[PDB]
Amino acid sequence: NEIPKPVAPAPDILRCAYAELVVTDLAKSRNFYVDVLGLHVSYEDENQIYLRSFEEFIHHNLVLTKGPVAALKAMAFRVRTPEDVDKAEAYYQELGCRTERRKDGFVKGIGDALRVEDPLGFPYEFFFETTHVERLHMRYDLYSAGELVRLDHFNQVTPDVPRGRKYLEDLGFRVTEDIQDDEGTTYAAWMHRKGTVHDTALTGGNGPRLHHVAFSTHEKHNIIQICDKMGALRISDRIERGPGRHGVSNAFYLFILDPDNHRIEIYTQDYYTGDPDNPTITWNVHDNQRRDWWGNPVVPSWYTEASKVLDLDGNVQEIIERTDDSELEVTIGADGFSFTRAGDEDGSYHGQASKGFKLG
Amino acid sequence: NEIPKPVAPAPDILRCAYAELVVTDLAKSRNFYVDVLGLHVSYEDENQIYLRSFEEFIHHNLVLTKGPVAALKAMAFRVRTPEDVDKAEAYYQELGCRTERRKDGFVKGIGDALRVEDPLGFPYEFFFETTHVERLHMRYDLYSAGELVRLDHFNQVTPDVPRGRKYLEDLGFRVTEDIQDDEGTTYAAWMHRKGTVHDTALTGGNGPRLHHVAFSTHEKHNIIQICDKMGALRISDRIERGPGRHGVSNAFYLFILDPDNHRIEIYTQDYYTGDPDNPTITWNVHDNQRRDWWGNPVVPSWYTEASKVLDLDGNVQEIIERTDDSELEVTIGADGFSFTRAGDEDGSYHGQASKGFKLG
Amino acid sequence: EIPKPVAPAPDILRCAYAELVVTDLAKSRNFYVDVLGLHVSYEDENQIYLRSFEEFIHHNLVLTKGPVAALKAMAFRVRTPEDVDKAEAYYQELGCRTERRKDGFVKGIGDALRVEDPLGFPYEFFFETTHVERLHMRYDLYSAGELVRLDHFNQVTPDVPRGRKYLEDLGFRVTEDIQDDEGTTYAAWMHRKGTVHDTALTGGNGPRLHHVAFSTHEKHNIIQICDKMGALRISDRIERGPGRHGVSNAFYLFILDPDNHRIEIYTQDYYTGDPDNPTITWNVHDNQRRDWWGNPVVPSWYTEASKVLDLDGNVQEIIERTDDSELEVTIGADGFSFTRAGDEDGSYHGQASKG
Amino acid sequence: EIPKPVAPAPDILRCAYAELVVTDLAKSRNFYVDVLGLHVSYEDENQIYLRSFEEFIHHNLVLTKGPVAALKAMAFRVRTPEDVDKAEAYYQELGCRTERRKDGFVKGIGDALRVEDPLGFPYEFFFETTHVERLHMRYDLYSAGELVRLDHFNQVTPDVPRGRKYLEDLGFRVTEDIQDDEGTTYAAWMHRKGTVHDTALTGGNGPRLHHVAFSTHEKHNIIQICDKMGALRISDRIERGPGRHGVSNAFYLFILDPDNHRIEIYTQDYYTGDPDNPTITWNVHDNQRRDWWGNPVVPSWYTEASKVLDLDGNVQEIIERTDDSELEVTIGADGFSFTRAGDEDGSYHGQ
């Protein structure tokens, strides 16, 4: 059931800007995002913590909101002009989606804002107005050995990747890389507005669920330091996967888990995608260098676990099961297959993960 | 069973200096060590390749010798004076070990040298005299993104760790770190002469076998590049384990496999141990941060596979089975267990490896 | 003052390549390929086409053999084929000389417009380019000093506000500038692609080309370039740096090619893509504005820059700056700079910082 | 010349700590703790004891409040308790003033000998020291500019060959030096622990302490110290660097504390533990010998250094160097340097 291209013009989206995550214990979440990861507090009270990255000048990149059920409440994109908020509302209304408009914002430090239940069930926000804060980009007196410098992207789990992809393309996102097989299945797509590999991404699976939110560092040693610090804090069990080099995106990466199991990616040194004919890279799902370039196996939780998302009433969205083939199953499952070199039996894996492991 | 302390004085050992590895295909081995890893050729012909690291001034750190059976032929330590070669001879003769002395060396670029079949079955060489070569430490016109800068250590597999450790202490090696359990079994020990965490190390297992030879890089990004390069060359299947941060030694590391399955470790940034009361560190075998500080699982091959070693006639040394408990079995096997925090079931793993894998 | 055309500006994506005239193609090849590691897309006896590690367009740099070393063309890529028509109509309304070739001026570029712009610089605008193998994951080739992207140009021009207004009308947004308390502007940086700049204006006699800048992934890659140059015993071709910039916050290095074209190596500036991106103005006497660590700026950096050509290949006449000189006001005989505004301690009178 | 004693030399392991007199303890604390990130081992209203990230002995630096900023002692650890007795007999034979404190001079050091050595420097030798928590895996504490080890001292002394021979007799091995064709020695670097140096001699008016050096893991940690100093608007306290040294091949930075004591931050020199380690001699006119990239050495780096104290805490009188001056022969009015030997292109004359 293809999502039609509206007649109404798409809003001009600049970039991913922030996520609002509902968390169950505000103090525990603060310990993770401020004490462990070093994000900078823009505002806080007994109910919410507003955080930003080192180089950010808008009010925040992450809002932690206390609530009964941990979930993504909104993933927010900044648009180019005030008028683009109106455009977003018209566009989503033409799509038959539920929308909510608040002239003075949903969260502090954001002004006129539109939230929508998008066609894939995700809570998106579009805004232009935001309170500017001290840009900390040269505050080396504050700089952490693991400093998170920008918000980079979101990654969403959705059962039908082509359907979602076409809709995001009409919205103005361009696909930079994807993962497909030779039987017409798409397992994942990455798409951008700001000229990096992505602002959001679609990962095939039961959904809507939020896979992760990604922050960047300046250098690879910064990511190493986050791992090292987690070991010193004896929370290495909260390192889910990595560190590694991605095939898709070519970024150096790490995946960690917050106190409510919300997955955070730390990411650095992908490439420029701003030209409109940027070459789209398609990896085969059985290429064992596509997710980790070094061939390290992808732990099953990375495929199966992701966060709930909320509707505009704050209720959890029903999960719709994926019927397309599962990346987990076709790569590391019982009938799975992966290769190191296409066409070479040597360095290939049948019914198990790479590097001597099987599914727990 | 115990190896007695000789009345004869131990030779004053400076450091690990080089290994001679037998390889089956000299050209394939050359491609690995020179073209992939960037080691510097000090001499080569149809029978051997002599290689050194970027900062070395002695003739070589690695001799690849063509032969029918891939194996370690000699682990060589440089001694402080010519007279220390005589001391090595008298010492091992007193221990009842087979020795062979060549005034003009066993390999090119080494002078007066003593080889011995040591009490643990290993072929050790002791030498002072060596041909000095151009020290390439400032040849940044040659420096590669993955540059190997020193030889750091060897790691030996032997069935009875305390037996070997006592013997090495009498030779002057001082233990820096080890792995034990609460019931008094020793699994591994690291010991040094040169003021780093180790020059050699004992890993409990069937032996004698050579577990690995280790080279150092300047920085962590150099190790990352070796991984990246191996992905680009589509030989990621030869990255065995890593990259990571060690618990033991605190070094950043990587384990890769040469064309004959000889394991090479790349290592950086361990600490100073030269003071005589250098604090020893003992880790519990069930501590999942002891080998990889970030908790990443140790692939079973790392525990089970190691290179054959030769006797002085060039024949393979018979293997003696370990009877003490197996590290693999007590940690990642079906009956093993490991913990993130001592005493905490959260972040513990029972009958499987960390992060969600079981053994393949 | 340069008027704003009625005609719509072209939609400019980014700086894309420079064409440099060099006098000895072999010596230039040694510097750019052997020393700096750039990748050859094409070469013959007259020209070398080079690209950075992550590029997919044909080239980021063209070395063209010629009698007088100079900038021949600074090229920006535009969003669509129709934007090259928009560029042509725009520069015509501006009264500028233009030349358009449906098959390009250099190999690997198709339909292209070159202009002598209102400040005397040879701009090219194009969309069509021959795609080549993007080397971004070719870690088998990766150098310890690898140049990964083309980042920006920097232009010397006598009247900065005049130039700034023209580039703003063309769609560039000022991210950072350098001014004083007496109304003088000494420099401005401006962008299309969401980094600190795609081009920049440095106040001085002009038109001249100050430098062309390439990126590395990390700081250590820039350190390696310096280390390599020492090993090759060509450290005399390191002009300034390495350092941390104040303006841009990037880690940097300035080196000189065999014809004294200045190349900057640059890494890790910040995102400027939001339209209300806060502008940062530095005082010209702030000794942390160019080098954040207070290291002195050698006079050659201010005084030396490359000639630029018109569309016929002749050198552009240099027009003298009459506004105050950043050299003179900070490190000349009557210069001044401070470490902390209003503190005599750490200030410099009539001399450069650090002794 | 300084005669070799018949008494055996103490077996010196390494440079271990310096005691610096500072005039304003709180300002000094800001610098070494807040700016540089050193770790407190003990403090009171008169002294701050500080250590690096990987240290297990009590401290690498003692800041002592006093009227005149100076080096009070540069301390070397010896291998055994008996080596303190050896040091005492050795310096007594040399005719030096010595002072033995069986319970140490500063907290966390036990039996210790301080001497006014033959070059006028206050050396300490000790074995016993209170072990503290070794912070080497305390990544929860690790700074982006983390100082990981004490690496070396550098001493200004007028006659380098005289001092060199005295240090060699004590067991130090020279690794690198700077000379000219006329036979003058301008500087020498010498070690016990298997790095390029534990101490070094810079030709000049002395005794003065040129600097104390700490190590970082990587080059980016040094860059961060500079960046942090910029952010704190104290970039005027960056003296020289960052750079790559020629001698030592280390990546380096020189900064100045509140009393103008010079601190070097240093990383990635090479192994020198073999007894036949090849010695490297640079020509004083080679513009890549100090900074490999050919950046100029600011004259203050040659002319400024810290006072040193005698055992009564009074400042040691200075002896003027009579041998040729490295500043004068390279950057002075009749000085010169080269990039490539024999090439006027890339050479500097009177600048």
Ligand SMILES: O=[N+]([O-])c1ccc(O)c(O)c1
């Ligand atoms: O080359 N020099 O200027 C040097 C080399 C090493 C040092 O530790 C130093 O203080 C100076």
Ligand SMILES: [Ca+2]
């Ligand atoms: Ca298929």
Ligand SMILES: [Cl-]
């Ligand atoms: Cl992935």
Ligand SMILES: [Cl-]
């Ligand atoms: Cl290990």
Ligand SMILES: [Cl-]
């Ligand atoms: Cl600048």
Ligand SMILES: [Fe+2]
């Ligand atoms: Fe991601």
Ligand SMILES: [Fe+2]
């Ligand atoms: Fe090892």
Ligand SMILES: [Fe+2]
């Ligand atoms: Fe620039």
Ligand SMILES: [Fe+2]
């Ligand atoms: Fe030094």
